[PDB]
Amino acid sequence: VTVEEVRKAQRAEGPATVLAIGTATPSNCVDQATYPDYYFRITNSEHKTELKEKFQRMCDKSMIKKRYMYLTEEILKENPTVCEYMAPSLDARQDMVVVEVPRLGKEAATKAIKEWGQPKSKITHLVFCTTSGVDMPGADYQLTKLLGLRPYVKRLMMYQQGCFAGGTVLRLAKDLAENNKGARVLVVCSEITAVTFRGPSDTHLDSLVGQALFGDGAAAVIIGADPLPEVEKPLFELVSAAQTILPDSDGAIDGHLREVGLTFHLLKDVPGLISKNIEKSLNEAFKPIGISDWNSLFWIAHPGGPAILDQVESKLALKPEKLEATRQVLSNYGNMSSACVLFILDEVRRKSTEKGLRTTGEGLEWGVLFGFGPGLTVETVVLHSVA
Amino acid sequence: VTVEEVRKAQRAEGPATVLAIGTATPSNCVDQATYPDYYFRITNSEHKTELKEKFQRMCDKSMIKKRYMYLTEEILKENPTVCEYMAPSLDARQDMVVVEVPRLGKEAATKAIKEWGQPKSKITHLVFCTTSGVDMPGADYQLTKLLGLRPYVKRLMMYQQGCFAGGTVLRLAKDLAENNKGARVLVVCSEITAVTFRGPSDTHLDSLVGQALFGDGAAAVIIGADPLPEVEKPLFELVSAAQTILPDSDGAIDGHLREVGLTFHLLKDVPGLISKNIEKSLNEAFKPIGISDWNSLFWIAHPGGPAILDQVESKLALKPEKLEATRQVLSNYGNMSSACVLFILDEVRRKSTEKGLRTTGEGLEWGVLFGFGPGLTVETVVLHSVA
């Protein structure tokens, strides 16, 4: 037998297809309205009255109503170094997220697999993504053990990538599914802010921004090409996937894993940089297939913060309806990093089904999924809806 | 315009092909024969006679002649916490490797690209792998920046996987190259032991094994499908790629990133586990091809330790010269983790040319590449040589 013959028999035929979506969050629901009172109490910072006033404004303008957090008051009372702005606490943080990340990931994966309707032994690939903690063997191994997947599942562990990774994992699963016949890829993004939670500082307001925006959550997706008729139910098709680094964006967002845990730094105008350059990525993606009206697409954008959405909306003159699904998730979950865009994808097909629309993409044919993160990196995924 | 139409024009035709191999190490060469004297001196443990005696026997049995290490005596003098067995030192270690890992990686990448002969702007994908530190943005961004790759290069950052990742990155690049027409993938593995280096402890001899085996190094590979005639020169073909977790190997190899840096643990007979199970991976991979004689293959195996090679050799009854290239790399470089098999792959084709053999695979047609690591995980890649 020749290599050319193996290649022919080994590869799939059709486009990568989203076959199921499942989501999960911690049980502790934290409402944004009174978070500043709670936050400044548990971090023993109630004497910092002016800084609390600043934080109240941050939360009021975050356009977040609630978040879900693994960290509770009880847990934080047992981990006082985590409550400090900067105290040695990495070990404490790691002990938490090394367990919680794959645990929450399992919940999302179970729901996705349940929707899927196929035996979990049919899962051939696993892409696990997180920005919360690192370990060897990784969370991918732990999840495989918790779920009881086949030991010969082909795993890819994606650590410490940040907010754009939601697009990255789809970009990955696409090539895995399309290049391997019978391949069914379980994608899981799980994020826990226990690694980034910390007390307030008067001279580090960019770190406070994180405390106002980031929430916990996990999302899982099954992806495969050549869907089995009747048995499997396509939701979306992955058409193409691009990644790029924005011009003049060096050091805009930095995150370092230190003895004090994961630190968060903002140096440049992230909303300005994204809105200034995003149309270039839209052109690159959609010019080949003859689309120039961005309002004719159904949208999924990472809600890093409300300012990104507002300025992208303004720059492109998007109708308010376009980013409704995005803003809805931001409102009800906050910024769950890499998992966000998968929650939003789930929201789009939900509202489409509920409204009884022509397609899973709000009745539209083509869509776009955006991830934004450190780099500054922009992930662009072209989507097609299903009837 | 249809999705099906896009897919047909989007994919590549032929098998993923290795077009170039480049390697690099720190300039500081460390002699293994006298390493026990040096190591126990620089870690202020000269008074630990019995332990030093044990370490001398470890080093003598390691079958390593020398290693290359970024860590010099000068650097260790300025970072005393790194010399201790367990002292807070992660920040010091991170400051080192966040820079060195992409620096050494670029050195290897430049060599590969030079052999390749094409413009670096023809690189469409970057797979970067390392077990040495984490940062946001990651080493993949830094490499893209330093090397001057196009901003829209599609990056995959693989952190904290360990020794089996040498096979993982090939499995990855295989799908990226074969599913995307014109795709050319730069794969880079870069490993720096500055994260794991620590002083000796009476009651943690498994950690001491690491100090005897692990060395620094980086390897880079250009991978693509549909090689251009004349201008590009194929070296190997990637036929298939598998991954699996061995039975009853739970917790055989653990690695934890903590405030003392990266720790290393052994709990089970790793050589025994691999040797006992490796033939299952061989059959699973080669029964389809119609091969059952493992001596008809050319071999690349991760030299985790000499014991693994010796027990695999006897278990399969391999002719002694089958693991010649593997042992040669172990002797000259030690265990460079994920980069090892790429050094060995380079050794095989150089050695074959030097012998004037009919193929790049020691004059043979089919070959196998193994990675072993935390899981206990095994990666298996079927290779085909080039005339």
In whole angstroms, what is the distance from residue A192 CA to residue B9 CA? 40
Residue of B nearest to A7 (CA): B15
Structure tokens at B270: 């790793």
Cβ–Cβ under 8 Å, residues A220 and A19: no
Closest CA–CA distance from residue A195 to any residue of chain B (Å): 13
Cβ–Cβ under 8 Å, residues B161 and B375: no
**What residue spans define the domains of chain A?**
1-234, 235-387
Q: Which of residues 6-65 of A touch B (CB under 8 A)?
A: 6-7, 10-11, 14-15
Structure tokens at A227: 């869907």
In whole angstroms, what is the distance from residue A296 CA to residue A281 CA? 16
Record the resolution, in angstroms.
2.1
- H or E segment and range at residue A23: strand A17-24
Structure tokens at A166: 């939601």
B151 in contact with A, Cβ within 8 Å: yes
Closest CA–CA distance from residue A33 to any residue of chain B (Å): 31
B113 in contact with A, Cβ within 8 Å: no
Of B138, B171, B375, nearest to A154 by CB-CB distance is B171
Report the 3 state secondary structure along chain B.
CCHHHHHHHHCCCCCEEEEEEEEECCCCEEECCCHHHHHHHHCCCCCCHHHHHHHHHHHHHCCCCEEECCCCHHHHHHCHHHHCCCCCCHHHHHHHHHHHHHHHHHHHHHHHHHHHCCCHHHCCEEEEEECCCCCECCHHHHHHHHHCCCCCCEEEEEECCCCCHHHHHHHHHHHHHHCCCCCEEEEEEEECHHHCCCCCCCCCHHHHHHHHHECCEEEEEEEECCCCCCCCCCCEEEEEEEEEECCCCCCCEEEEEECCEEEEEECCCHHHHHHHHHHHHHHHHHCCCCCCCHHHCEEEECCCCHHHHHHHHHHCCCCCCCCHHHHHHHHHHCECHHHHHHHHHHHHHHHHHHHCCCCCCCCCCEEEEEEEECCCEEEEEEEEECC
What residues are paired with A129 via a beta bridge? A158, A189
Put simply, the answer to whether A259 touches B259 (Cβ < 8 Å) is yes
What residues are paired with B366 via a beta bridge? B384
Closest CA–CA distance from residue A197 to any residue of chain B (Å): 17
In whole angstroms, what is the distance from residue A68 CA to residue A29 CA? 5
- The CATH architecture of the domain made up of A235-387 is 3-Layer(aba) Sandwich (3.40)
Q: Euclidean distance between the first and final Cα of chain A, in Å?
A: 41
Give me Rg for the CA atoms of chain A: 21
* A236-245 vs A377-385, strand pairing mode: antiparallel
Cα–Cα distance list, A300 to A296, A341, A344, B217 (Å): 13, 6, 6, 41
Put simply, the answer to whether B175 touches A171 (Cβ < 8 Å) is no
Residue of A nearest to B255 (CA): A136
In whole angstroms, what is the distance from residue A140 CA to residue A145 CA? 9
A251 in contact with B, Cβ within 8 Å: no
In whole angstroms, what is the distance from residue A4 CA to residue A155 CA? 26
Q: According to the entry, how was the structure determined? A: X-ray
Residue of B nearest to A265 (CA): B136
In whole angstroms, what is the distance from residue B145 CA to residue B322 CA? 40
Backbone angles phi, psi at B27, to 5 degrees: -75, -20
In whole angstroms, what is the distance from residue B308 CA to residue B271 CA? 4
B95 in contact with A, Cβ within 8 Å: no
Residue with tokens 């939670």: A197
Closest CA–CA distance from residue B282 to any residue of chain A (Å): 13
Residue of B nearest to A246 (CA): B151
Please identify which of the residues A59, A83, A129, A163 carries the catalytic annotation.
A163
Cβ–Cβ under 8 Å, residues A147 and A103: no
Q: Which of residues 154-183 of B touch A (CB under 8 A)?
A: 154-162, 168, 171-172, 174-176, 178-180
Q: Euclidean distance between the first and final Cα of chain B, in Å?
A: 42
B377 in contact with A, Cβ within 8 Å: yes
Structure tokens at B380: 């298996």
- The CATH architecture of the domain made up of B1-234 is 3-Layer(aba) Sandwich (3.40)
Q: Enumerate residues 6+ apart whose C-beta is below 8 A from A305.
A: A62, A209, A213, A270, A271, A335
Sign of the four-CA dihedral A44, A47, A48, A49: positive
Residues of B with active-site annotation: 163
Tell me A151's DSSP state. Answer: T
Of B155, B284, B384, nearest to A3 by CB-CB distance is B384
- The yes-or-no answer to whether A1-234 and A235-387 have a common fold is yes
Q: In chain B, which residues have their Cβ closer than 8 Å to the Cβ of A242?
A: 152, 154
